Amino acid sequence: DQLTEEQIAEFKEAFSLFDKDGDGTITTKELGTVMRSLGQNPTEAELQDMINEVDADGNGTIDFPEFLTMMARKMKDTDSEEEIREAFRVFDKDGNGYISAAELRHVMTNLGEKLTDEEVDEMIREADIDGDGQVNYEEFVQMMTA
C-alpha cells in the first residue's frame, strides 16, 4: 500500500482545514476549533494529549509530515495490532483467544467511553460470531489492522 501522490494531496487538503492560515502547523486552537464546529467538545487537556501523540518537535504543534505519517499509518502498524490484542486478552481469562458475545457487549457498553447499543450491535454483527456465541478476537484484531 505505497503512499501515492494523490493520497498525499487529499491529506494536504484535510490538513489545510485545520491550518486555515497556511502557517504549516496545527495547534490546540486550530484542532479544537474544527472539532467544536462539528459539535464535539474536547477539553484543553484532551487537545494537548492528542497533539502530543504526534508532535516530535515537542513545541505543541502538528506539522504536515507528522499529519501525513499518522494518516498513512492509521492502525496498520504492529504496535497497534499487539496492543489491541493485549486489550482483548485482559477480558480473556481462559487464555484461549475467545470472548463471549455477551461479555463483549457488557464491556463495550458498561466500561470506558461506552458504546451505544447501535454501535455495539454493529460491532457484534461485524465479528463472525460462532454458533455458541463466542468471538475469536484475534481475527477481529486483524480486520481492524489490515
Binding site: 489545510s16 482545514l17 464491556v107
Partner: protein, 354 residues
C-alpha cells in the same frame, strides 16, 4: 459451516492444551515428565555392571514407546498450531516450525530414531541418551527460571559478596591456625592444602570425617572457628529465600489493586470507532456520498486516529506500577478546586453588595 467451526474449536482446544496449558491441562505435561525422568533413571542404571542387562532390555521398550509418543505429539502440535491467524497454510506451518524449540524437538526425535535404526560404535548410541533432558528444558518458557534467579541475585549483590568475602577470610584463617596446631601430631594435616580441604569440608558442614583434629588445641580452635564461620557459609541461602518470599508478597499485593482496567476497555472502543469510520451505515447516506468536499470525512477520520493514539498510550502505561503518593495528589487537587470555589463565592459577594 457448523462442522468447520467445530473442527476449529477442536484445533483451538488442542493448541491450548499443548502450548498454553492452565488448570487441568498440566496433567498432560506431568505425564510427559514422568515419561522422560524415568527413562533417564534407567540410563543411569545402565552404567552399573551388575544391572546392565535388565536396564538395556527395559530401556529398549521404553524408548520405543517414547519415540512413538513424541512423534505423534510433534505431528499433532504442528497441525493444531494452525488455529492462530499467524500460522495458516503450508507457509504458516513452515513459519511455526521455524521456532528454535520446535526444530530442537525435530532434531532430538530424528536423532533418536536414526540412532535406534543404526542399532539394527554402540558407545555413542548410549551416549546420545543424555539428549532427553532437553524435553524438560523446553518446559521452561523463554528461560523464566534463569531470569527470576538472576533478577533476585542482582538485587542482593552486596550482601552476597559480603557473605562470601567474610567466609573466605574466616576459612583461610581457621585453616592456617588448625594446620599450625595439627602438623606434627596428625598425619591428616601434612600440608596447608590438606588443612584447606579439611576447613572447607568442615565449614560447609559437610563433615566427611576423613580429616579430623586429634589434639585438644586443634579441637578448641575448630569449635570456635566453626561457631564463627558456619553462619557465614549459610547466609546466601537465607538471603535469597527471604528475597524470593518478599518478591512473591510484593507481587501478590499489586494483584489486588487492579489499577490497569479502564484503559484496555477504552482502547478497543477507540479502535472500533476508528475502523467503523470506513464501513459504518452511519456513512452510507446520500449526505455522505465525498464528491464535493472529501476533506470533511477525512478530517473526522484524522480526529479518530488521534484519539486512538491517545487511548493506546494510556493503555500501555497501565502496565507500569503506581506510587502510594496518589492520596496526597488527590488532596492537592481536591483542596485546590475547593479553595478556587470559595474564591468564586467571595468575588460574587463582592460584585453584588461590594
Amino acid at each position: 459451516s457448523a462442522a468447520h467451526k467445530r473442527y476449529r474449536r477442536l484445533q483451538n482446544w488442542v493448541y491450548n492444551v499443548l502450548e498454553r496449558p492452565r488448570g487441568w491441562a498440566f496433567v498432560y505435561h506431568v505425564f510427559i515428565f514422568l515419561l522422560v525422568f524415568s527413562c533417564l533413571v534407567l540410563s543411569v542404571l545402565s552404567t552399573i555392571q551388575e544391572h546392565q542387562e535388565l536396564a538395556n532390555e527395559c530401556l529398549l521398550i521404553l524408548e520405543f514407546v517414547m519415540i512413538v509418543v513424541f512423534g505423534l505429539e510433534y505431528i499433532v502440535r504442528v497441525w493444531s498450531a494452525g488455529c492462530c491467524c499467524r500460522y495458516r497454510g503450508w507457509q504458516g506451518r513452515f513459519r511455526f516450525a521455524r521456532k528454535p524449540f520446535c526444530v530442537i524437538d525435530f532434531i532430538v526425535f530424528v536423532a533418536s530414531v536414526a540412532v535406534i535404526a543404526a542399532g539394527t560404535a554402540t558407545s555413542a548410541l548410549r551416549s546420545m541418551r543424555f539428549l532427553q533432558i532437553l524435553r524438560m528444558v523446553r518446559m521452561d518458557r523463554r528461560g523464566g527460571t534463569w531470569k527470576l534467579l538472576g533478577s533476585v541475585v542482582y538485587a542482593h549483590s552486596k550482601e552476597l559478596i559480603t557473605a562470601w568475602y567474610i567466609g573466605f577470610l574466616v576459612l583461610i584463617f581457621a585453616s592456617f591456625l588448625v594446620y599450625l596446631a595439627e602438623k606434627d601430631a596428625n598425619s591428616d594435616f601434612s600440608s596447608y592444602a590438606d588443612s584447606l580441604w579439611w576447613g572447607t569440608i568442615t565449614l560447609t558442614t559437610i563433615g566427611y570425617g576423613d580429616k579430623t583434629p586429634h589434639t585438644w588445641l586443634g579441637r578448641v580452635l575448630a569449635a570456635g572457628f566453626a561457631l564463627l564461620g558456619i553462619s557465614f557459609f549459610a547466609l546466601p541461602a537465607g538471603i535469597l529465600g527471604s528475597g524470593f518470599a518478599l518478591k512473591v508478597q510484593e507481587q501478590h499485593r499489586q494483584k489486588h489493586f487492579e489499577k490497569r482496567r479502564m484503559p484496555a476497555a477504552n482502547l478497543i472502543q477507540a479502535a472500533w470507532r476508528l475502523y467503523s469510520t470506513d464501513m459504518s451505515r452511519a456513512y452510507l447516506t446520500a449526505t455522505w456520498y465525498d464528491d464535493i468536499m472529501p476533506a470533511v470525512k477525512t478530517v473526522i477520520r484524522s480526529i479518530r486516529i488521534l484519539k486512538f493514539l491517545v487511548a493506546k498510550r494510556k493503555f500501555k502505561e497501565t502496565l507500569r506500577p503506581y506510587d502510594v503518593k496518589d492520596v496526597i495528589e488527590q488532596y492537592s487537587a481536591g483542596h485546590l478546586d475547593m479553595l478556587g470555589r470559595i474564591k468564586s463565592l467571595q468575588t460574587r459577594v463582592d460584585q453584588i453588595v461590594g
